[PDB]
Design an enzyme around this catalytic site. Structure first.
Site, short mmCIF file in Angstrom:
data_model
loop_
_atom_site.label_atom_id
_atom_site.label_comp_id
_atom_site.label_asym_id
_atom_site.label_seq_id
_atom_site.Cartn_x
_atom_site.Cartn_y
_atom_site.Cartn_z
N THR A 48 33.91 44.70 -32.49
CA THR A 48 33.31 43.90 -32.90
C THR A 48 33.62 44.48 -34.73
O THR A 48 32.42 45.37 -34.29
CB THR A 48 31.45 44.21 -32.87
OG1 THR A 48 32.27 43.11 -31.39
CG2 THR A 48 30.76 43.20 -33.81
N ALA B 31 26.37 40.19 -26.59
CA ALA B 31 26.10 38.77 -27.44
C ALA B 31 25.03 38.40 -26.51
O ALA B 31 24.42 37.46 -27.68
CB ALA B 31 27.39 38.63 -26.62
#
Lengths: 202, 65, 197, 214, 213, 201, 220, 204, 123, 197, 202
Positions: free
Chosen positions: F1, F49
């Site tokens: 990410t 997430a």
């Protein structure tokens, strides 16, 4: 596993169950745990199957060479000493409890116990294996001096049957061997030939 | 252990481990773990089976000594 | 690691701290304030575990401001330091301890300047000078060598600059800028940042 | 239970035309020791449901007590409603999952057999709350030893009669006695039918040991 | 000392179309190297427009489906209407996160129609992270099937190819083919394939056998 | 990410990748890592997430309740403080969150970094995630406060693209947002392959 | 993996499945798990596959040397002794478990050999993850002095039970029939499992793939 | 864990009278890429190739030692090696280090000399060979490769269809793997020519 | 654990306890506040000066924060409790919102506290 | 952590390394050379565990000089890199493993400039540019962004300066000075140290 | 520790050894392990001494209160049920193996075994403790239906003597208690009164 050797006047009587387990699974229910080391010398094997098999093979090899060299029948004490030397030299690498029983022209019937660790002791009778704990009191209260060969066979069969009934690692059939001067007589007890003891109910 | 998330997605360092999404199967989770000594009379030595080597269990689960 | 230092003079306390907020191998912030204004004459400098520092410092700050609002007078630096030590010790054996190292600088109209040292175990010591962090090992000796109880604030700033120059020369960490503040009878004054290009 | 002390071995289940048959041995093992050789691991829940359990015997007795009290209360109501085998299976699944989620599981594997409204029920519940229905069931070592035989017979003949099911159950019990070290040759056979739940025992299988001479 | 989890196999596949949704799964329930049962579908009908697929730990799957059914009935009681697919997805996300520190070991895929009638596929991680997809594979064979769906449904890495919309017949054929391949390569997938087709006319179920080994 | 945000003259530029991973397996290439808390606040996803999504949704609920109670929108600093206080209650319990709270309030453009560890720092530029080092390297060489709008877009896209080039857990598509005084706007969503064609050739 | 063998009235029948897995994924659907040892001795293998392959190859080479020197047909006891001694002196680090069967001057012999060096001489043996299902089949249906066709059917049933009840077994059934007059290596013997027929077609055509660079080297 | 340190993926496929071998090009340490042109496929003859996935250092060491032994064999025998003989040689080389294993899983593709019969095989890290008839895969994304190959492979493919199949399989498999990619190189081995192509792939 | 309902409705539709509280307020000293353009002034009458009372300790005007102050009329001890609660609220709001309270916010908090004491058991 | 960087141009290789030798939290040396001259046109840059670096680098250097003395000509950079990789791989599984990260820079009369990357596991990779250490994460993106294969040595020095300025700004470690060397057809030339006072 | 209870027609016979050990040291060699729960109900305690003593005290308390409330002599099944409830509820906190034996006007003599874990089973005879493993075969081969009180006493004495001979954790004296309708008769076997079995020699 339950193994048992008893001495009578003319020789010895050997006995063993036939169960080999890998955990709770019976891989071999007709195992032969009575191993002939010489003509009149047998051994009972308990513990690691590979270790006991290798040690028995090596002792058979050495004892055969020794007997050929001396042109004399081997002593049961000599086979016990070879087993003891091998089991003590490799006590950290082996897991083998041996019972050596046989007949000698110079000494008659003899029972030698070589437990794990590698000590050697002569006994009137010996019991080994995981199932031998359950029959200590029975053999203590039942054994007597001067038993004949047939009485020794019945005693060994009864003790083995009790141990097989109580021990989960013991079972199958009862293999008996009687060794004397004339030779070695072997028999298998199975089915209803095995001694029966009724379960106490109510 | 089986459910560990966000450790490696937040920085390349640190003892924390895991990606953005939780997935035990993709992570280190035993699943149908089998002992290398199952179906054997005795226990195999430690490191007997190298990781990644093709191995066939000697017996089903629960048969370990 | 992050660096604190305080020097107490005859009528002042001089404090400084590094302005680096770091995550892993990256300096996320180059101008980070580590001092908290407890009152008009008390400064709290906190370092330690992320999150714990700001939570504990703001808890203490709000309690001190509430004391001033309730009673009409401010807490003395000694009383504030003892209150902070009591709260830290209470939390140490509690469910959520705080891993914070504190410097408490303050000026009292009666007691004069005061500097306090508190480790994460909540042990409170009064010192003429003190430092926190890995840089303390490198500059406490310089402070011992050159500090005098009658040191003027100009010489105090010079001694602080010597300590920070030693940090530049020997410390393996990148600590380029420091925020400098002084407390005297006239309150808290922000001095010029000591920077090393 | 974190460590089962006295445990029972595999339990079998098999659906046939008109009911279900359940078999379990009468041995409670203390580790490798065959300690209690005359215990019953099959219970009659009501006129239409029976239950056999593997694993910890004390947990099985606790479940016996709780289920018996539930059935007693339901009969006390006298409203014409009785727990179906499906309802008992669902309640057992809920109880096992609830105990597992508290990290205090009941160390059992249960086989539920029942006959209601002309339909046979065979249900499985384990200590983790995993539950399903199948025409044949086998816990413990019977999943490896007895289940393949039952599955092969049901593949060749999907619908079995009571006599065929009983014969197959006896064969599986004999195989389990041959190859399971924690088993005994004294077992019970329980059958639920239109007429209710009947339990037979103690029974022994006929064993062959002729390979010892080979 | 015990492990509260066990992997029971099972692969769930969902494909969203212009006016349809497909949820497909295998019916094999296993544990370790054994097979528990060969008839255990992993698709559950929630409403007339929603189908959920659940794979992973089977006890958690049962508990989660029962909880979802109860929650749907509660919502209908409180609001006098059935839940929509997106509302079900959001509620499932909240439910999964409610056990963040002792998660449901479940791989959830929701397939159904949105408020405008288009097919909607939602994929869930065990702690409730979710997003809307056009297709998604979950379970043991998900890593096997996802690239092939990317190639076939997404037309990825293919040049000089038109992006034709997916028809129902082609989607059914593709689902059957990928499950046959998964049964070839995955040891947990087999013994049947159950396909649920969500349309405006209702939910249609189809069963297709797989190899028994 | 890889997520980045920087303050410049014309607002806050927020960029992110869209790759979610499960070990070495790429679970998704279309994850929306920029969270629209409300028409005035933005949040970023890095780490778990589900954790980031759930806690920023709770932050959105709290912000809406605040707006209803006080008849005024919450500030960026207040929202970041609320989120930090929310996540500090579960310190050491396994939460994984790295987020940037971006918005525009009475104090001007606001940019705060909040993590599950407990950090809450206001800054001009930030970069969170596994590929944040590469994004930092590109952004610092390219950043200036007096950047133009299109130049800021190009800088953010290039930094995210380089991070995805060097990071195994970064990839997919680059989502670009621009926080302005009237509210954020979604600028573009460019696939990494298209950016590679634009940049290499 | 399911490997099994029986002693029938005139020889040895060995059976195996042909599926090889790496973890929970099938890597080979046609794997030969019955290994040549001597023209009259064969072996089925389980455990570390490389260990099994190398051990069987080494023992086969040594038995070939022994038979070349003596000029006689090899004995199954010689192979068993060699295998067990070699396995024992490695203390189980060679994780090879074997079903050894053959016919010699003394007749048909069947052995099961374990990685630590312990052997059992039995009329029927099973090994592998599907060994318990095959053993159940044997204990249900085995009788001594079976005919060749009955023994083949029994071994096929045992291997089929292992295939259909174990996740690690599958694909085809391989049979090795050994007698004093012939040897039958049946591969495959049964095909109980096949790939399902295609319901549709995949998109795979020329020019679908974009190419950056291409280099062609002509081989004379 | 050790095998996933550097990533990588190698695949071999069988045609009607041809073989194809493909590999990704990324070289990296954990999650950091270092180079995008790492060689994993090595020629072992005119129509013989070996692909190595695993530890990059072990890849290079095994390739160099195999080249050593193969050069000695070809100098002594006076002929080119057969692919089955090369597979046996690799198995022996890997099993010599049974207790010190190299962390590589070789993949061998080639045509038998004087017959040009396609041959493919794969080996584990200690040298267990697996000769298949359709495809062999190795690396960190074996599940994706297995799915793609089982879906796309057909018997008796021409070299063009074989190229398209292996290219699509490798591309879509490495598109779903984090530590594999940064390009794909494909070798098509025919009786009369060898074609080497680099594919237009994703670089993220 | 006293859970009596002190404030209850009456047949006329009135809360008698609240009316009596308002009457108690009506007995307090007059407090006057005026909102100017850039100043705010508060004035409180003293009902009696004993020439020996310490004026500092009987101030009916107090500051709640740096920007908010209040004056009251009624029972001095109840006002003291309310003032302390308001001060704690102002400090906590500055803690959790990082900004001083608005006058309306603290007025809302005080009014909500009074309303809670008008509808809770045992008070 | 120590930092190495190499940049290869059309006819040159440019290398740089930090000059810091650190023990615990203290920099013991401010001018520490990490480059070993293998030959007249080969430079070896080594970082890693204490002791291992010098032992391995000097063993390789002595072997390369022995080759030159025995044969009359020098090893090519490719051959030297392969020899180093072979030795490191051999030591990897031996009783005496070396934890060293290496950059080999060299110019060949025929092949031209070459730069090689080797990790502690002894995997050898040819690169147009490479870096070692924690600072590699912060500078490899800049190198990817700004490097071109036709970069001149002046622009190469500028790009290296950009990378070192980023290291100054963002790295948490104090790396104030760097030694810079360039290899071309005329040999190894020592450039001016890049320092940040 | 070895404990034993045998049921005859008119009641039960309970027996135990007297050795308490802390490792290999005998802290108490005259321990009384037969605990009266009620007038005609006794319990044999094995396992943790503190756990067994606490559970016995609690069960005595509960059974006395229950008997006073019901104005009836308590049932042996009721005492066994109380023991089972306490042992099963706290199976993760207690290490207690209990044998409950006594006489009932309704059910006569009864023997109940409550091993570790908390299960309850009625047996014709029960044995417990670490020494019980060595006398399983003896009690299997020696027990018979229809033994009188004297035969049961001699049987229990023989089994306890054998177990004490073989088990290192068992020894001291043999404490016997016969429970019937007339009451409870307790006796102690020490020295030569303990049955003797000759050690096999040569």
């Amino acid at each position: 596993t339950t193994i048992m050797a008893v001495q009578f006047d003319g020789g010895v009587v050997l006995g063993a169950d036939s169960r080999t387990t890998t955990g709770s699974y019976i891989a071999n229910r007709v195992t032969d745990k009575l191993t002939p080391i010489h003509d009149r010398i047998f051994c009972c094997r308990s513990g690691s199957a590979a270790d006991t098999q290798a040690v028995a093979d090596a002792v058979t090899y050495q004892l055969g060479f020794h007997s050929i060299e001396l042109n004399e029948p081997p002593l049961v004490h000599t086979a016990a000493s070879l087993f003891k030397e091998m089991c003590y030299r490799y006590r950290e690498d082996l897991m083998a409890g041996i019972i050596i029983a046989g007949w000698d022209p110079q000494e008659g019937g003899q029972v030698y116990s070589v437990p794990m660790g590698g000590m050697m002791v002569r006994q009137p009778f010996a019991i080994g294996g995981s199932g031998s704990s359950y029959i200590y009191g029975y053999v203590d209260a039942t054994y007597r001096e001067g038993m004949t060969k047939e009485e020794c066979l019945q005693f060994t069969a009864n003790a083995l049957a009790l141990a097989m009934e109580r021990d989960g690692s013991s079972g199958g059939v009862i293999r008996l061997a009687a060794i004397a001067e004339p030779g070695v007589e072997r028999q298998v007890l199975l089915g209803d030939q095995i001694p029966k003891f009724t379960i106490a109910t109510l | 252990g089986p459910f560990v998330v966000g450790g490696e997605d937040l920085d390349p360092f640190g003892p924390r481990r895991g990606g953005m999404i939780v997935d035990p199967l993709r992570s280190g989770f035993p699943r149908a773990l089998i002992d290398p000594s199952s179906g054997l009379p005795n226990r195999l030595p430690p490191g007997a089976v190298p990781p990644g080597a093709r191995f066939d269990p000697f017996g089903p689960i629960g048969t370990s000594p | 690691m992050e660096y604190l230092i305080g020097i107490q003079g005859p009528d002042y306390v001089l404090v400084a701290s590094d302005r680096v907020a770091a995550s892993n191998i990256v300096q996320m912030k180059d101008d980070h304030d580590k001092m908290f204004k407890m009152s008009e004459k008390i400064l709290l400098l906190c370092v330690g575990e992320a999150g714990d520092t700001v939570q504990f410092a703001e808890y203490i700050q709000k309690n001190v401001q509430l004391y001033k609002m309730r009673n009409g007078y401010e807490l003395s630096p000694t009383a504030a330091a003892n209150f902070t030590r009591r709260n830290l010790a209470d939390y140490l054996r509690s469910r959520t301890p705080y891993h914070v190292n504190l410097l408490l600088a303050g000026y009292d109209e009666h007691e004069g300047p005061a500097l306090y040292y508190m480790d994460y175990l909540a042990a409170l010591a009064k010192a003429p000078f003190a430092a926190h962090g890995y840089g303390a090992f490198l500059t406490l000796s310089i402070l011992d060598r050159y500090y005098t109880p009658t040191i003027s604030r100009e010489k105090a700033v010079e001694l602080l600059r010597k300590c920070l120059e030693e940090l530049q020369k020997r410390f393996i960490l990148n600590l380029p800028t420091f925020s400098v503040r002084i407390i005297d009878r006239n309150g808290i004054h922000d001095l010029d940042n000591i920077s090393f290009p | 239970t974190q460590n089962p002390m006295v445990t029972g071995t595999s339990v079998l289940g098999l659906k046939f035309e008109g009911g279900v048959v359940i078999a379990a041995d009468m041995l409670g093992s203390y580790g490798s020791l065959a300690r209690f050789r005359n215990i019953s691991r099959i219970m009659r829940v009501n006129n239409s449901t029976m239950l056999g359990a593997s694993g910890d015997y004390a947990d099985f007795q606790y479940l016996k007590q709780v289920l018996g009290q539930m059935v007693i209360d339901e009969e006390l109501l006298g409203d014409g409603h009785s727990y179906s085998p499906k309802a008992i299976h669902s309640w057992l699944t809920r109880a096992m999952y609830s105990r597992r989620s508290k990290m205090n599981p009941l160390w059992n594997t249960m086989v539920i057999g029942g006959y209601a409204d002309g339909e046979s029920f065979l249900g499985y519940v384990d200590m983790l709350g995993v539950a399903y229905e199948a025409p044949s069931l086998a816990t413990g070592y019977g999943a490896y030893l007895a289940q393949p035989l039952l599955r092969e017979v049901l593949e060749k003949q999907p619908v079995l009669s009571q006599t065929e099911a009983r014969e197959l159950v006896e064969r599986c019990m004999r195989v389990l006695y041959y190859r399971d070290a924690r088993s005994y040759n004294r077992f019970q056979i329980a059958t639920v039918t239109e007429k209710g739940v009947e339990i037979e025992g103690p029974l022994s299988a006929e064993t062959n040991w002729d390979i010892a001479h080979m | 000392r015990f492990s509260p989890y066990a992997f029971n196999g099972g692969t769930v596949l969902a494909i969203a179309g212009e006016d349809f949704s497909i949820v497909a799964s295998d019916t094999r329930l296993s544990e370790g190297f054994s097979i528990h049962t060969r008839d255990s579908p992993k698709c559950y009908k929630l409403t007339d427009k929603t189908v959920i697929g659940c794979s992973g730990f089977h006890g958690d799957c049962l508990t989660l489906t029962k909880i979802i059914e109860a929650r749907l009935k509660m919502y209908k009681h409180s609001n006098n209407k059935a839940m929509t697919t997106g509302a079900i997805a959001a509620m499932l996300s909240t439910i999964l996160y409610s056990r963040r520190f002792f998660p449901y070991y479940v791989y959830n895929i929701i397939g159904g129609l949105d408020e405008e009638g288009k097919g909607a596929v939602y994929s869930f991680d065990p702690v409730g992270s979710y997003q809307r997809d056009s297709f998604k594979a979950g379970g043991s064979a998900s890593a096997m099937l996802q690239p092939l769906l990317d190639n076939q449904v997404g037309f990825k890495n293919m040049q000089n190819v038109e992006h034709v919309p997916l028809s129902l017949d082609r989607a059914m054929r593709l689902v059957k083919d990928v499950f046959i391949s998964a049964a070839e390569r995955d040891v947990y997938t087999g013994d049947a394939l159950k396909v649920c087709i969500v349309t405006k006319e209702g939910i249609r179920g189809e069963t297709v056998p797989l190899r028994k080994d | 990410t890889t997520t980045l945000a920087f303050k410049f003259r014309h607002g806050v530029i927020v960029a992110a990748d869209s790759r979610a991973t499960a070990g070495a397996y790429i679970a998704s290439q279309t994850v929306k890592k920029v969270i629209e808390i409300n028409p005035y606040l933005l949040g970023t996803m890095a780490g778990g997430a589900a954790d980031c999504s759930f806690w920023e949704r709770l932050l959105a609920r709290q912000c809406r309740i605040y707006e209803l109670r006080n008849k005024e929108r919450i500030s960026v600093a207040a929202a970041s403080k609320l989120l930090a206080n929310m996540v500090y209650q579960y310190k050491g319990m396994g939460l994984s969150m790295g987020t940037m709270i971006c918005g525009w309030d009475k104090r001007g453009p606001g940019l705060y970094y909040v993590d599950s560890e407990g950090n809450r720092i206001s800054g001009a530029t930030f970069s969170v995630g596994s590929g944040s080092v590469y994004a930092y390297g590109v952004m610092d060489r390219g950043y200036s406060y007096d950047l133009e709008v299109e130049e800021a877009y190009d800088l953010a896209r290039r930094a995210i693209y380089q991070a995805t080039y060097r990071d195994a857990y970064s990839g997919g598509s680059v989502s670009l947002y621009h926080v302005r005084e009237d509210g954020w706007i979604r600028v573009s969503s460019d696939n990494v392959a298209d950016l590679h064609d634009k940049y290499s050739g | 993996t399911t490997i099994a063998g029986v002693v029938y009235k005139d020889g040895i029948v060995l059976g195996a499945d042909t599926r090889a897995t790496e973890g929970m994924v099938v890597a080979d659907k046609n794997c030969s798990k019955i290994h040549f040892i001597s023209p009259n001795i064969y072996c089925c293998g389980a455990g570390t596959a490389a260990d099994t392959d190398m051990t069987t190859q080494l023992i086969s080479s040594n038995l070939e040397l022994h038979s070349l020197s003596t000029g006689r047909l090899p004995r199954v006891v010689t192979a068993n002794r060699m295998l067990k001694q070699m396995l024992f002196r490695y203390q189980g680090y060679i994780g090879a478990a074997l079903v050894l069967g053959g016919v010699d001057v003394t007749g048909p012999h069947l052995y099961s050999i374990y990685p630590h060096g312990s052997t059992d001489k039995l009329p029927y043996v099973t090994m592998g993850s599907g060994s318990l299902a095959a053993m159940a089949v044997f204990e249900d249906k085995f009788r001594p002095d079976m005919e060749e066709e009955e023994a083949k059917k029994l071994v096929s049933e045992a291997i089929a039970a292992g295939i259909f009840n174990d996740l690690g077994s599958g694909s085809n059934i391989d049979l090795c029939v050994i007698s004093k007059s012939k040897l039958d290596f049946l591969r495959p013997y049964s095909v109980p499992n096949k790939k399902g027929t295609r319901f549709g077609r995949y998109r795979c055509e020329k020019g679908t793939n974009a190419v950056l660079t291409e280099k062609v080297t002509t081989l004379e | 864990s050790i095998m996933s340190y550097n990533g990588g993926a190698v695949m071999a496929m069988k045609g009607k009278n041809c073989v194809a071998i493909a590999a990704d090009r990324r070289f990296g340490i954990q999650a950091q890429m270092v180079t995008t042109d790492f060689q994993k496929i090595f020629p072992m003859g005119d129509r013989l190739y070996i692909g190595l996935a695993g530890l990059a250092t072990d890849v290079q060491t095994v390739a160099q030692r195999l080249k050593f032994r193969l050069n000695l064999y070809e100098l002594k025998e006076g002929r080119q090696i057969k692919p089955y003989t090369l597979m046996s040689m690799v198995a022996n080389l890997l099993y010599e280090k049974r207790f010190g294993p190299y962390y590589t899983e070789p993949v061998i593709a080639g045509l038998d000399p004087k017959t040009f019969k396609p041959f493919i095989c794969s080996l584990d890290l200690i040298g267990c060979p697996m000769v298949t008839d359709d495809f062999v895969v190795s690396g960190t994304c074996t599940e994706q490769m297995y799915g793609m190959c089982e879906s796309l492979w057909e018997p008796n493919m021409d070299p063009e269809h074989l190229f398209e199949t292996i290219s699509q399989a490798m591309l879509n498999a490495v598109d779903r793997d984090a530590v594999s990619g940064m390009g794909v190189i494909v070798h098509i081995i025919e009786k009369d020519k060898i074609t080497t192509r680099t594919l237009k792939a994703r670089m993220d | 654990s006293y859970d009596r309902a002190i404030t209850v409705f009456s047949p006329d539709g009135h809360l008698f306890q609240v009316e009596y509280a308002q009457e108690a307020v009506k007995k307090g000293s007059t407090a006057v506040g005026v909102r100017g353009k850039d100043i705010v002034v508060l004035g409180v009458e003293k009902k009696s000066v004993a020439k020996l009372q310490d004026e500092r300790t009987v101030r009916k005007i107090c500051a709640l924060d740096d920007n908010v102050c209040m004056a009251f009329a009624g029972l001095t001890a109840d006002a003291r409790i309310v003032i302390n609660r308001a001060r704690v609220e102002c400090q906590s709001h500055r803690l959790t919102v990082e900004d001083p309270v608005t006058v309306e916010y603290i007025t809302r908090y005080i009014a909500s506290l009074k309303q809670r004491y008008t509808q809770s058991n045992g008070r």
